[PDB]
From a paper:
[name] is the first [name] to be structurally and biochemically characterised. WsaE is a multifunctional enzyme forming both an α-1,2- and the α-1,3-linkage; [name] is a β-1,2-[name]. Both enzymes utilise dTDP-β-l-rhamnose (dTDP-β-l-Rha) as the donor molecule. In the CAZy database, [name] is annotated to GT4 family, which is the largest retaining GT-B fold family with currently 11,446 entries.
The crystal structure of [name] was determined using single-wavelength anomalous diffraction of selenomethionine (SeMet)-labeled [name] crystals at 2.28 Å resolution. The N-terminal domain comprises residues F26-F222, and the C-terminal domain is formed from residues T228-N381. The two domains are connected by the loop Q223-N227. The C-terminal α-helix S390-L413 crosses between the two domains and forms part of the N-terminal domain. The N-terminal domain has an eight-stranded β-sheet that is bounded by six α-helices. The C-terminal domain has a seven-stranded β-sheet that is flanked by five α-helices. Three regions of the structure have poor or no electron density, indicating conformational flexibility: the N-terminal M1-N25, the loop between β1 and α1 in the N-terminus (Q58-G63), and the loop that connects the C-terminal α-helix to the rest of the protein (N382-E389). In the crystal, two [name] monomers form a dimer related by 2-fold symmetry. The dimer buries 1900 Å2 of solvent-accessible surface per monomer, and the statistical score provided by PISA indicates a dimer, which is also stable in solution. The conformation of K302 is disordered in the native structure.
Residue numbers in the entry:
A (entry chain A), B (entry chain B): 26 to 381, 389 to 398, 402 to 413
Write the structure that this text describes.
């Protein structure tokens, strides 16, 4: 088996429908609690802001089908097969097994894309829709949450994901973060309209932000082996240099949050201890007592953990990436221009020795106001 | 299992040596014939240009060890273990199996890096050398043949590859192609000095360029399933649309050169037939007979096959990538801004219907002029 075809772009065939009103269609890979992380969770929150009184609503599942357990967090929605065509106000349709099957697409069906392959499909549905109903192309809403070609080496998927940004028909970009919008602007992408939303502190975490802290000798690592953008292996190699080169490294505890993984030997009997996904209560507790953080994001997006860590009194090691430099956002953030295990280890020694106030990101504490503005354009 | 280390950056330990003169040390992944294409082949050709009368020469194999047959094109070099320290004028040392072992590194050993991990090792050796011998850092010569972070998704390997360009010690960059140089300059990378060499037609192909041409209805495809940058699966998907959409597709032969693969069914009983690696002679004969070419390169680098095809009278489909647009170089080249299977297929239809002489890249048919200037500088 050599790579022949591209699974992300399996045709997404439609048939016509009699359904009359405006209907917003959110294309998401999955709604499984299993996959209820970052992007999908944000898209759903955003989709929830659209006025139900003004738009019917359908969620189309592109990659995975839910459990009965999964559907419990969508009780108000009707679960409906694609062979069916029913005028429900709220519905969910599984469509990850698409071969020789179609989904009903109405004249005024409007599409909201998330993952690049969902936008890839939406842009082909819109053309089919235009030809079929004899109408000008409807606007697509594209919730852009990272430069998704960066999830791939230069390859077919890289250029197909980038192709979604070069689409010339009507398309509203909504960016996760201003920095990401600006990265897109600098590369010269054009959209009919552009919007962004900024990172906002978790509401549970904010309630702990003013608690008295009793700082301990803890280095807190954002550890996600499965998300390569988080540079897990680079952090681990940096920790090994730190442990060997710093003679006081035995005084320190090194802890991982994010993704549960096996504890890793770092030298001198010291381990990176994985806690994984904590409740927000427990995470807040760990942040209050932690003194140094490491959180890398190979992307123009700031990522959330460095922002959380900085507001809880941690000196936080993170990375510059092109237009992104978080060192200007908050006095607790240390940004590395040259990212190798040696510089990370050196910086960690200086920070450990520092253990022995200024914020320019007031937006982060105290959101989708532009949704009404978008409602009127769709 | 999870990765805990980064294999590309395994320590590359040195020990001192008494050897006296200047010595040029080519760091290459391997010299095996199976890998004697692309970058490594070009690095050896450049290395060959340096004066044997002025420099001792050593080749250091960082990834793979030669078979007896592989050393037959290196009869003038002595093959020596890293445990030995001999003052030969010409030698090859294997150093891919590194653990608990050292390579001898003399005071005036100068390093020539190729793959990014070889530059990453060189930059550490140089610092070690500077401290051990009490000398200012020696210049590294860096043969940069592509933007190598682009061989990875955003990841640890991505940033480590990029860190080789951000190194602040003395470093001369030698770029494969002016386009690649411009790409680097546009991203703001700094080096002590910058040189580049331009694409030159293979001399054996050149011998067939003046021959009579009997053009057939053949579409020629550069098929490299293993080289993601060549977007094989994209081409296959565009070919399947072409076959289905173009009612005259049954008139055309579609042939693949580059890497051997199974013949792929495209529809209508038409196959993409794989010829794989051909002698230069057979390739020339095919080029003289083919009328349309497809060769993709997801990289600022031009790649060679588009240029080869365009000089043999083929109408060539290729891609733009940032500062690269090959349609300005030669009238036979069509460059696609929007790269999807549909646009490729549509272009192929236009070129087929075209079946029913202007070059701005003269350098190509008329290379290391800077070697002397570098020699004086090292």
């Amino acid at each position: 088996f050599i790579e022949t075809s591209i699974p992300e772009i399996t045709p997404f065939n439609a048939r016509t429908s009699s359904i009359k009103g405006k209907r917003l269609n959110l294309l998401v890979p999955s709604i499984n609690q299993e996959h209820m992380f970052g992007g999908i969770s944000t898209a759903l929150k955003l989709f929830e802001q659209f006025d139900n009184k003004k738009f019917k609503k359908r969620i189309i599942l592109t990659d995975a089908t839910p459990n009965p357990k999964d559907l419990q967090s969508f009780k108000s929605f009707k679960y409906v097969m694609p062979e069916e065509d029913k005028d429900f106000a709220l519905q969910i349709v599984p469509f990850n097994d698409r071969y020789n099957r179609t989904i009903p697409v109405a004249k005024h069906d409007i599409f909201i894309a998330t993952a690049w392959w969902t936008a890839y499909a939406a842009q082909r549905i819109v053309s089919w829709q235009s030809d079929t109903y004899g109408i000008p192309p409807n606007k697509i809403l594209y919730i852009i949450q990272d430069f998704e070609p960066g999830f791939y080496q230069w390859s077919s998927q890289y250029v197909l994901a980038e192709s979604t940004y070069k689409y010339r028909g009507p398309q509203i970009a909504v960016f996760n973060s201003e920095l990401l919008k600006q990265y897109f602007n600098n590369k010269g992408y054009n959209f009919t309209d552009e919007y962004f939303f900024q990172p906002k502190i978790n509401t549970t975490l904010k309630n702990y932000i003013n608690d008295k802290r009793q700082k301990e000798k803890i280095i807190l690592v954002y550890g996600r082996p499965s998300v390569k953008r988080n540079a897990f292996t680079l952090i681990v190699e940096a920790l090994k240099i730190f442990v060997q080169k710093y003679d006081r490294s035995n005084e320190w505890k090194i802890i991982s949050v994010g993704e549960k993984h096996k504890d890793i030997a770092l030298g001198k009997g010291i381990h990176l201890n994985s806690l994984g996904k904590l409740t927000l209560e427990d995470y807040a507790d760990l942040l209050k007592r932690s003194s140094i953080g490491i959180s890398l994001m190979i992307s123009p997006h700031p990522s959330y953990p460095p922002l959380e860590m900085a507001h809880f009194g941690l000196r936080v090691i993170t990375n510059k990436y092109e237009n992104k430099d978080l060192s200007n956002w908050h006095s607790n953030i240390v940004s590395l221009e040259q990212l190798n295990p040696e510089n990370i280890a050196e910086t960690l020694v200086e920070l450990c020795m520092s253990f022995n106030e200024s914020s320019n990101m007031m937006f982060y504490i105290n959101e989708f106001s532009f949704i009404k503005e978008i409602e009127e354009k769709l």
